Write a protein that binds this ligand. Structure first.
Ligand SMILES: C=C1/C(=C\C=C2/CCC[C@]3(C)[C@@H]([C@@H](C)OCCCC(O)(CC)CC)CC[C@@H]23)C[C@@H](O)C[C@@H]1O
Length: 250
């Protein structure tokens, strides 16, 4: 049974594609405005040295902070999001920010060399850059596995934006008040995605795979939170972050 997308579902897709195009610059032209990337000698991947310098933290914190601002803008355009109270909106944004960043970054991720390529060598981010920002393999390895698995689903941009929207409007986040309204908004998005898939996605299970990526994201979120807490213990770490990053992860 392949019901056609309703006029409403078509509108939801057009709105999400527009929101993404307005909030994700595929040329990465703003990145030179961030504090500059610095890459120190760390072939040994020394934790002591990485924590002592946190060379790539200013740049990656600025990239993440910028990305959170973009995610806030994207979320505000999701059909139904503005119906939620501001408190619920903020709870959802703070809890999903890192997950949406991991999802949206798949657009710059490339399997050519397993990096997030955003321009010249200066803005090519590799695993070694994340270690230079103070993170460990317990987060990085699973993150790369997630990027590759997501890349291989070969999602249509419609599916990609719907997945980000579904990730943000999740009723099971701790602290949510009106879970039922959030579930209604999410269900409207989920049905749109399921309909789109069994309608526009050429053969050769995709929906279940996408749902599984949302579960993987919860695991990555938890590991990232654990590592952020540890990083926050490093003296002077707050200056290398930004007020928005401090609030969202603090
Ligand atoms: C962001 C975006 C991009 C890349 C994402 C990356 C590469 C760098 C390392 C990141 C940011 C990972 C992250 C695990 O690295 C640094 C973690 C950052 C922090 O915990 C808080 C700032 C301090 C160490 C998650 C996603 C990774 C570029 C572009 O696709 C826009 C997108 O919007």
């Amino acid at each position: 049974l392949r019901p056609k997308l309703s006029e409403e579902q078509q509108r939801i897709i057009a709105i999400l594609l527009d929101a993404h195009h307005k909030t994700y610059d595929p040329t990465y032209s703003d990145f030179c405005q961030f504090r500059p990337p610095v890459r120190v000698n760390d072939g040994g991947g020394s934790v002591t040295l990485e924590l002592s310098q946190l060379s790539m933290l200013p740049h990656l914190a600025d990239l993440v902070s910028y990305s959170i601002q973009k995610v806030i803008g994207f979320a505000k355009m999701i059909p139904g999001f503005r119906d939620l109270t501001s408190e619920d909106q903020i709870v959802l944004l703070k809890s999903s920010a890192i997950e949406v960043i991991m999802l949206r970054s798949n657009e710059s991720f490339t399997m050519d060399d397993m990096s997030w390529t955003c321009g010249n060598q200066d803005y090519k981010y590799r695993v070694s850059d994340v270690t230079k920002a103070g993170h460990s393999l317990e987060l990085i390895e699973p993150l790369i596995k997630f990027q590759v698995g997501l890349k291989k689903l070969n999602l249509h941009e419609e599916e990609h934006v719907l997945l980000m929207a579904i990730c943000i409007v999740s009723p099971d986040r701790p602290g949510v008040q009106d879970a039922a309204l959030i579930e209604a908004i999410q269900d409207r998005l989920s049905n749109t995605l399921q309909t789109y898939i069994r309608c526009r996605h050429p053969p050769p299970l995709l929906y279940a795979k996408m749902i599984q990526k949302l579960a993987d994201l919860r695991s990555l979120n938890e590991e990232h939170s654990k590592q952020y807490r540890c990083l926050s213990f490093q003296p002077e770490c707050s200056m290398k972050l930004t007020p928005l990053v401090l609030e969202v992860f603090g």
